[PDB]
Structure formats: structure tokens, C-alpha cells
Design a protein around this ligand. Sequence first.
Ligand code: 89I
Length: 329
Amino acid sequence: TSVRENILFGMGNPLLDISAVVDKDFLDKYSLKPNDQILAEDKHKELFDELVKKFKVEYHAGGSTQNSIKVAQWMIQQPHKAATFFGCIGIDKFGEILKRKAAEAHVDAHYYEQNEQPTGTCAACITGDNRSLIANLAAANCYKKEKHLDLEKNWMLVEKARVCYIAGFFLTVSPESVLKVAHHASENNRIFTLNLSAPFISQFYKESLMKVMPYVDILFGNETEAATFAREQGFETKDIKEIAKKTQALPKMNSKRQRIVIFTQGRDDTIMATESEVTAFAVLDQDQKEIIDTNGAGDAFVGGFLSQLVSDKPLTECIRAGHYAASII
Ligand SMILES: CN(C)c1ccc(-c2c(N)ncnc2C#Cc2ccc(N3CCOCC3)nc2)cc1
């Protein structure tokens, strides 16, 4: 093996995933479309506490960036604490559970804990054939870099790292801290990776997303996200195989590393753009998966891919583990 700890740093919104099995007489209370993912409003406050009661649940350390780092450590059977992760949580039992589920993943998590807000949480409300998801960010959105990421002891773990990845959802929380990490990857010429996460980031956080873009070694994104990203910046093309070209020719601050743009397409090829020219890799099929996680499998692609890049392997092999990873899920 001989891979080393804290070799891959990650950072993002730690969400505590709470799945179970409900019905509808539990959903109509809070009125929720059987298969839809939205954000929690002040009329959903209880829905959390009332999902740990009347329903048998599992507790997984969730959130995109955190999902990707745990899958990267899974494919990283050894050593342990090979991947690190910073985020904000609350000082309540939910955060207690999160701290636990992550160590129980050999992930080296180091959280910014606080009281103001509860630990965030995502709610898996499955009726078997649906996915009503309720997300409440809370604590994940209170991260303070000056009192956590800026501290010597944690910042030294960002130093032990030779690869950084942050899902773009985190730009909605702290671009200043996304930046300190990206910038640093430049100054010490290490790899810094990023996710477009959702089309809304490209449409509504472009200023923050363009500030880090020059400091972005690799870029992860999907079909649609790719699509909207081009729409704004003015690429004109609608051809993904082309967008990957126009984007990756974007002003890259560090010039010592030319960039790689991996645009996934759900389960259907993968478009990589490098300094040379654009190729395309077809996916591993697992046909007629009615259960197909689909949404949230791109997080798994990213972990598997990351697991192979922390060892500087052929991009073709990083993309191989991306499929091994997405999915066991
Ligand atoms: C679809 N929902 C459930 C959804 C999607 C994705 C996430 C998500 C995940 N998976 N992992 C980590 N962070 C976030 C996060 C986050 C997040 C979501 C939305 C948002 N805004 C949307 C409205 O405009 C203001 C910015 N800002 C931040 C959570 C919830």
C-alpha cells in the first residue's frame, strides 16, 4: 500500500443522513411530494425529531463532500485516516452521532462544533418507491474559517495533504475558506479539485465560482450542471464533448498544471478534457436498477476517482474506480 494519512483533504457541509421507512400519513402532516428533494422551512422543524421516534432508522455520515471522502476511504481500505474532512456541526446528540459514524469510517474528521444552530441533517423518507428528501443545513452553514481552518493544528492537516476536493455546495457557505485551500494548492503546486454540485451554483454563485476557477486543477460536474455552467459564462456549445474543452481552457492561475475536466453523464459515458484532446469513457452497466440511487451516485464516482489520484495513477484508472465506486450504492 504505502499510501499516507491525511493525504486527501476534504471540506464541506456535514449533514447527518436519517433514513427509514415511512408511509404517507407521516408525510401529509408536513405535506411532501413522495419523490422530491427540497430544503427544510420553519414548518418542518419537528420532522427531524419525529423521524427518530416512530420509525426505525439508520444513521450515516452524509453530505456530498463527506460522501465522496468516505467512499474514497472505502476504496482506501488502508491505511486509515488517509482522508481528512472539515465541517461545522452543532453541540447536540445529532453531531455526536455524526462524529461517531465518520470515525466508524476511518475518516479523519475534525469538526467546528457550536451551539447557535443544530447539526444539519438530511431526511430519507422512503416509501419503498420514492425519495422525499428534507435537508436542513443549520450548523453546516455556520463554518468559521478564522476559528477552525485557520488554526495551526487543523491547518497542518491541510498541509499533510497532496489532494484537495470540495464540493461546490460549500461555496454557498464559505468562499473565503474555499479560496485559502485552492490558493494554497497553487502556491505549493498540489492538486485541488472541485464540484459544480448543482446548476444553481453556476447561475447564482458565479462570482464565487469564478474566483476559485483559476485555482481549480480538476473540475467535476455532470451533464446538466455542465450545461448551465456553459450557458452563463458564454460557451455557446451544447455539446458536452465541447464544453469540456472551452471550460478547461479557462484562465488557470498556476500554469505548471494544465487542467482536467471530468463531466459525468449520470450513467452514460464520461467526458474527460485534458491539455491534448477530449476522449470519452463508457460506463459499467448494471441495467434495470429501479433502486438506482442515480442522484448522489456522482458523489460516489468522485470518491473512487479520488482514491486513485492520491497515488498519481493513470486518469483512465481514476475513471475506472469512479465506476467501481458508483455504485455499491
Ligand atoms: C435539493 N436540496 C435538498 C439539497 C441539495 C444538496 C444539498 C447538499 C448536499 N447534498 N451535500 C452538502 N451540502 C448540500 C447543500 C446545500 C445547499 C442547498 C441549497 C442551497 N441553496 C439553494 C437555494 O438557494 C440558496 C442556496 N445552498 C446550499 C442539500 C440539499
